Amino acid sequence: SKYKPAPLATLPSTLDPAEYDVSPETRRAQVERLSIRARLKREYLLQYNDPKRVSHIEDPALIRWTYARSANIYPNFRPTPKNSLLGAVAGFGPLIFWYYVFKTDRDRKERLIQEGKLDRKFNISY
Amino acid sequence: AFCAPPAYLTHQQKVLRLYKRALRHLESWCIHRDKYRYFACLMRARFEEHKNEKDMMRATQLLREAEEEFWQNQHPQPYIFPDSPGGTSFERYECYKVPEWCLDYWHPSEKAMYPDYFSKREQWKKLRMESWDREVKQLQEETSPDGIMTEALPPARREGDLPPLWWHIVTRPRERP
Amino acid sequence: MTKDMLPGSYPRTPEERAAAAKKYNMRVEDYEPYPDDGMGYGDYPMLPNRSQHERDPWYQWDHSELRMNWGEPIHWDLDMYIRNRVDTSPTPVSWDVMCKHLFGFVAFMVFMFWVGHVFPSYQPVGPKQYPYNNLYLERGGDPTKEPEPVVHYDI
Amino acid sequence: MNIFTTSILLIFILLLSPILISMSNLIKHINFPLYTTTSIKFSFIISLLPLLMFFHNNMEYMITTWHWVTMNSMELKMSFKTDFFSILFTSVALFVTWSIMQFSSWYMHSDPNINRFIKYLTLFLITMLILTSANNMFQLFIGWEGVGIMSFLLIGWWYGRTDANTAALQAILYNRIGDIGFILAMVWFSLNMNSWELQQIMFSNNNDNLIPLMGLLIAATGKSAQFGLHPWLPSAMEGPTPVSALLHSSTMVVAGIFLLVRFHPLTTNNNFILTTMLCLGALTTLFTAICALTQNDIKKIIAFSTSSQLGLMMVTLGMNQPHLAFLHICTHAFFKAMLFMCSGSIIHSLADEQDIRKMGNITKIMPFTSSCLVIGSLALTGMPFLTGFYSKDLIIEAINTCNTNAWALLITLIATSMTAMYSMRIIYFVTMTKPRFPPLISINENDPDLMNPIKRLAFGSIFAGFVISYNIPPTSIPVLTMPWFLKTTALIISVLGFLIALELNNLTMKLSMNKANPYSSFSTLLGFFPSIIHRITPMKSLNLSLKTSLTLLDLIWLEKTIPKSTSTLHTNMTTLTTNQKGLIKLYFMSFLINIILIIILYSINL
Amino acid sequence: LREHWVHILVPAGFVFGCYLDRKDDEKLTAFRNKSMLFQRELRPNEEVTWK
Amino acid sequence: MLKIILPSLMLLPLTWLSSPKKTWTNVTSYSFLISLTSLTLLWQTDENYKNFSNMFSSDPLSTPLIILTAWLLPLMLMASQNHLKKDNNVLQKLYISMLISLQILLIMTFSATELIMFYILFEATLIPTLIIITRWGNQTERLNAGIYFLFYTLIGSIPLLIALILIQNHVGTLNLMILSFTTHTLDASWSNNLLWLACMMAFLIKMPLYGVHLWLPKAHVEAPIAGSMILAAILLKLGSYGMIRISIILDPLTKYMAYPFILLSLWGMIMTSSICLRQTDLKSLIAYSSVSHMALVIASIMIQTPWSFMGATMLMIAHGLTSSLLFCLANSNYERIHSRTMIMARGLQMVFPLMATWWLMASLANLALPPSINLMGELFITMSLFSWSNFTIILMGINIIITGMYSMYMIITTQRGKLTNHMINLQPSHTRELTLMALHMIPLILLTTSPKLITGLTM
């Protein structure tokens, strides 16, 4: 019995110990969140229902997200031992691996053509 | 869908919601209506039992225990209404729900085939514009001096006034276009 | 759109934390930057790893498909968590219990297939037999060369 | 050979006139759904003349219509191999599509874009007739990939539904994993045989075709939803029911089985490939039957039925029984298509409800559908002298009397009993209990566009297997000699499966509560294969796409190393050599150093 | 003809270009009817194999 | 070629001397009539290439590229016509002039008979292109994209100029026919290894090769529409055309010197394809799609087999039409919502059903659906790469799977789901926007019926 969570199978809201918290400190957190939520929802509606609108409703939250994930990565990148190793392995790791697969294969192929031990029987296109 | 959720569920709401979930899952296991009726009355016996226990620190401990019991005896595949979230018809017609504003790009030769629908529509676009100013004004007048806010909205308190922010609700596409 | 409405660098002081939270429409006690390992996040909020399948389906979300609200901060990995892709919702069966059961079944079937390879089922019947030297010519054997007489008897 | 050739070629022209009409102004004046249905009907009737001529002569053809291009010494021509398989499949496929096309006019009568839906079904049919009559691998691939796209557009018919779009992309992803296999085989033959034509590939019978045949087995695995690549078939049930009947059961899904029938002359000399088909197929039939035993959606039960019968065709090919595996495809198209039509009739009449828990007592309120729904179940479960007996019975006779994998034999017989257990599940809950649907009853099934297409299949579900079995040439020697228990083995297990089902499904009437167990959770949750593979695998890959590739490499380390360091270096130099104090005193002092260095340089070169 | 004359601009260019290619040929006749492959005797009223 | 070039030089006086209300009609009418004349090059009834003079000459490699260039000029004029409607007259005529100048140079670049003449024309294209991206780009980042584009090219191109001069100082000439019929095997000394990289890095940057490709996603993401169309369709193929032309004089060093670049292409293409899965900008998703297709073109040219060349030539023309069609389609949304974010606008099939058909057909061309020539390229490159070594099928298998995902994910995201109903400015598609897509797609379909025309030199 009992349910063990994981990143790809989160904890149900009804099994969350911190969801039956009722101490006044939490309830005030949950009421400011709604107030922030309702303040925005009110502003979105005051544009959606506006009759003099002639264009779409620009989204600052979406502009920030796309900018955080492109134009803002590099300025906020600092080299460290873990980055540098990760980039070195990520960069040349796969490239060295494949070099030996292909070089090893084609050396076995060039070896077997000098000693004629290959069957290129009907092969006339390459 | 129509009512915006509260800031937090009360104990009373968390127990009713469980009650409904636990019955719908029972009906999923039982299938047969007579068998579903029998166990649904036993289920109510388990909720009437501790109906009055007003400790408020063991009522909670009676809910977390009961949710942890529900999560173990779930149906791995509960019945869902076809139009409900997760249902087989859920959002089936969302590709047929064209917004009303798409008619504002219609060619005149297209608008010439429905002269009387397109005449009962410029009235609605007038009614929308004349009402707008008074709607915005009313929403400030009720902006509570303390920032505490809720997603709900006020009605029209006067005569000749439509409730503020009414166009995206009144004009919404039909559920089955 | 201006520089202070856009993401910036990691917030070092609590005075630049409450500035960052207000940018992103969060409570100061809720704003939480990614850990400062210099991987390029800056001060973008670190939000709980819940896919959009877990959002209230019955609520009338502003961005209906994404199940977001206008203005709300967007998870870094949103495009990995949209409803068309990765789902992190709770399952009726624990994650590891599924993992132990699935591979136990697949592993067991793989074992039992090898067992069936070393103890095959057959019928008490000697090999089929064909005429004309195991049909030597009709299989494309060389007409000029003489096969090896392979013969079968009436019994 | 002109009348045979002309009728073969003429089938395509008939199916292309609905496509041409759809692209002109006429489509807005005529009853386009009826025009396509008449068009396909005439196509089916013409498809019988090539069929009869083959029954008389058994004489196959190879018709090269078009020369497309020459790549030095390798010509690619549009060429059709009108042999046994494509002659008979073409007729069975055109016969089923005549039912589904006419069914759709009743089922999709509300859909505003109905005549786009008709057009897509026609396009699928064309890309299925391209696939089956192809004479070279490249023209196979046109149909192979074409039905792949046409499935995407029909599974995602309701493109506003997010789960339809996910099921459609999921079908594409699994079928591109099987494209690797197809492409692997294609490169191999163009390199070791200089050709893609089936005639030239035949002279590879004495090579070692492991690499090409592994490719084709992977392509067949993905295209026929075999274990490993199987989730996409139950997920494809999002689309409208006419799509489920036509594509994802009686045509598109047999492409992988059809492919390996084409290349049977090569797989007969590979025991590794045969043994893999025998074990890969056996696993598929058991695993999907276990899944089907506890599903509640009507279509997923039927969709899971297909996966299991598809696996059995795969088991057949591992016996080196290619002509039985094909005869099963031809037989299985009839009743399986009907089951979707009979099931799709219920779904329409109950406000698009598909959970069998909200169906009941259908043998009374819907007599006609229930009657055809029980013919389909019994044809499926190998009852004597129905369409499904002239195929299933022989396969079960063969699986017993061949040298084979003991476990593949064992689980394949168990899965044959489960075919009766899960069929009984539908008969029971759908037709036999008490009503469980809502109380406003508006069930109508009097439309000819519903009764007529179902009847055609009903006749096919009864007589078709008999006619097919007696007209095709003798293919292989059946082992007709066996103990009395290996000759009735199929019937007893099927009967036993029913009997076991009755007892089990009649405990649900007891006023005793039902509980979860690990075995039913595994059955109900598809063995957890989707719940894991579709969560862990896309996470790791999509997480690498962002953290490693885009961020760590391109956005960061590839900037830092080349463009950024080059600009840093040169900015560093322009800063050192430009910050001069402007004092002539210091300038001449450097001019003095320069002069001494030239004196020194010239000194050591004397 | 004070706002439509511009339509001789491009057609003139083509004609001028075609003529400029006819000169490039006139300059490269050093092997006319002398290749090992196409050299032949001149027909009665034939002055050049190609122009 | 002087009958394709001189009339094209006349579109410049015609641009300036035409009326304000006739510039766009006149020039776009005569651009079509110039791309018709370029079909004369296709009259190749023999195995001898067309040599028109000492300067220009057309081959089966330079003819498809020449024609694709001439046909693209009228397409780009129509593409640039709605986002330039607010500019005064001299700016439009100055934009039309920069596009014509890029067509004239590109035609001379593919028809040149000598490497030095190729190089100068191959460098001159930076000027009109730098002007286009920077003067008429939209965002502040267009300034950094012009630098990245200008100096990736120039840094690579200086060694090529050195190497070309060494070739002439030794062989006496740079004529491509003479260097073909008098080529001498190179020694494997450490100096010729550098001569090889000198002759190759210029073209490997322009493809671009993986690693040195960051200029392309920067340039595309900020160029005006006609800047992306010419970049993705012709300027990338300057690299491929150069490598084919100059690799004849580099043997046998390509048997070993190519390994590092076959490996960056084969591995690099997987890195770029997987990026398109997580790319938040639609114009950026296409640009990385280009990088991953050119990877195969690089890999196939490095192995110099009749099939590999044949596949690369087909993929060069196929990618030319397909990538341009995608950029035009992404522009059509952008000219409505002025946002490049891919997830911002959704469910557009609901209100643009016909434009959603072109999306589907472009997307199907991108994922190489048979029998389109996009597959013929991918398929013949795979066949050759398999013969080169059998484990390349592992990496090409993966890249084919990823290519399906980001192609359909592109279609599913923007064309399906619910409509983003707040976008009340989604005007009906212009007749101009739809003609632009038909002009991309019809040639692509026609070339599939007659693939012989784009097999290249080997076949």
Ligand SMILES: CCCCCCCCCCCCO[C@@H]1O[C@H](CO)[C@@H](O[C@H]2O[C@H](CO)[C@@H](O)[C@H](O)[C@H]2O)[C@H](O)[C@H]1O
């Ligand atoms: C293998 C051969 C390939 C070699 C390729 C070498 C190409 C060289 C490109 C020169 C790039 C010059 O790059 C120049 O400096 C940086 C590079 O980040 C850009 O600057 C950008 O990033 C820097 C961060 O360092 C910020 O300060 C600046 O605000 C921002 O615009 C400049 O706008 C650009 O002009």
Ligand SMILES: CCCCCCCCCCCCO[C@@H]1O[C@H](CO)[C@@H](O[C@H]2O[C@H](CO)[C@@H](O)[C@H](O)[C@H]2O)[C@H](O)[C@H]1O
């Ligand atoms: C052998 C030659 C090969 C290399 C070719 C030359 C390429 C050019 C590289 C050197 C020039 C680039 O120089 C780059 O200029 C940018 C311009 O933003 C500087 O960046 C600067 O941006 C702005 C304005 O300039 C300033 O407000 C900022 O403080 C500063 O960072 C970078 O610090 C420097 O790296």
Ligand SMILES: CCCCCCCCCCCCO[C@@H]1O[C@H](CO)[C@@H](O[C@H]2O[C@H](CO)[C@@H](O)[C@H](O)[C@H]2O)[C@H](O)[C@H]1O
């Ligand atoms: C190899 C190809 C040939 C390359 C040719 C190079 C062309 C010149 C490129 C540099 C740009 C010329 O610079 C361009 O000048 C024109 C007028 O001269 C300006 O034109 C604009 O501004 C000026 C006043 O500000 C007005 O007179 C003019 O009518 C208006 O359109 C452009 O804003 C500017 O971009």
Ligand SMILES: CCCCCCCCCCCCO[C@@H]1O[C@H](CO)[C@@H](O[C@H]2O[C@H](CO)[C@@H](O)[C@H](O)[C@H]2O)[C@H](O)[C@H]1O
């Ligand atoms: C980062 C930029 C890289 C620069 C790349 C430039 C390309 C490299 C060119 C190959 C290297 C130089 O190639 C050089 O050619 C010259 C003549 O041309 C020859 O070198 C030799 O030339 C002649 C004999 O031929 C001798 O009298 C002379 O003493 C010596 O220099 C060798 O062949 C090689 O040393």
